[PDB]
Amino acid sequence: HHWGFGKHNGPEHWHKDFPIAKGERQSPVDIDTHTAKYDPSLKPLSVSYDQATSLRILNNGHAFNVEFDDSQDKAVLKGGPLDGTYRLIQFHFHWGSLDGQGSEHTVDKKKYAAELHLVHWNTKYGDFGKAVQQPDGLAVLGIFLKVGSAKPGLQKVVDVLDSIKTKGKSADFTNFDPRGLLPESLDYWTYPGSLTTPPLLECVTWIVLKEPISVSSEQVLKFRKLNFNGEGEPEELMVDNWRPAQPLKNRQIKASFK
């Protein structure tokens, strides 16, 4: 009976195994755009993905992760609110059963169809497992997806999903360029928060881009054909793998733009 996204083990149940679910800096949150403060001391983001080395794509039973070689400074995030260098380890998405829901963050209570998380860890802590135990251990770049035109840079991901339909399946996934998932603008909101799946550790500096990317209805429909279950177990479509917004508590969201 472990955590997931069904009726009996969904986000409202996670606090029984992970009491930090009711903590002081949980994610995601609603971004109230009129209450976020411009922070003119906020530097531009530096997204350095030209030497990124993707390795593999994995269905882990809650989402799929595209994993990267993070044993060297090959794909790094710097700047913005960050001190130091954060290395890309994986990206994944959250999405809905319908186009009207799927994002974890919301913007003035608006839900997007999906949300991309590019997860990075602070190299001063040496590895990901040490970084998640530190208040500044991770930096996650969040990008909203809306349905409209296709995103050409996503299609290589879409096309391998058939090979990782069920939990525990992986496939080689080299030479994928994550720069093809970024919008034109790097304007962002930032706040301190948490992982949005268990163990829900409060180790994340969130950087949420204001501009969404647009994917086609056919692209998101292929996400919804994945399965939460393992092969030869009853089929349960992988949809609605998003945590809803959590209370902001004693936090201020800052904006890089006015």
Number of residues that bind Zn ion (CB under 5 A): 1
User: How many CA atoms does the CB half-sphere of 141 hold within 13 Å?
Assistant: 31
Q: Give kind and range of the element (H or E) at residue 217.
A: helix 217-223
Looking only at residues 103 through 122 of this chain, which bind Zn ion when binding is defined by CB under 5 A?
117
Taking the complex as a whole, how short is the minimal distance between the CB of residue 217 and Zn ion, in angstroms? 22
CA-closest candidate to residue 111, choices 212, 4, 248, 239: 212
Rounded Cα–Cα distance for residues 244 and 200 (Å): 13
Is 62 in the active site?
yes
Half-sphere exposure of 91 (CA within 13 A, CB side): 25
Residues in binding site for Zn(2+): 92, 94, 117
- Closest residue to Zn ion, Cβ-based? 117
Instruction: Give the nearer residue to Zn ion in terms of CB position, either 114 or 161.
Output: 114
CB of 64 to Zn ion, least distance (A): 11
- For the bound state, the minimum distance from the C-beta of residue 232 to Zn ion, rounded and expressed in Å, comes to 28
CB of 101 to Zn ion, least distance (A): 15
Name the nearest CA neighbour of 248 among 126, 144, 105: 105
The residue among 47 and 140 lying less far from Zn ion, judged by its C-beta, is 140
Rounded to whole angstroms, the Cα distance separating 195 from 87 reads: 16
User: Which residue positions form the known binding site for substrate?
Assistant: 196-197
Q: Name which of 78 and 117 has its Cβ closer to Zn ion.
A: 117
What single letter denotes the amino acid at residue 258?
K
Shorter beta-carbon distance to Zn ion: residue 47 or 114: 114
Which segments are annotated as binding site? 92, 94, 117, 196-197
CA gap 209, 255 in Å, rounded:
10
Q: State the catalytic residue, choosing from 34, 62, 105, 120.
A: 62
List residues with catalytic annotation. Answer: 62
Q: What is the contact surface with Zn ion in residues (CB under 5 A)?
A: 117
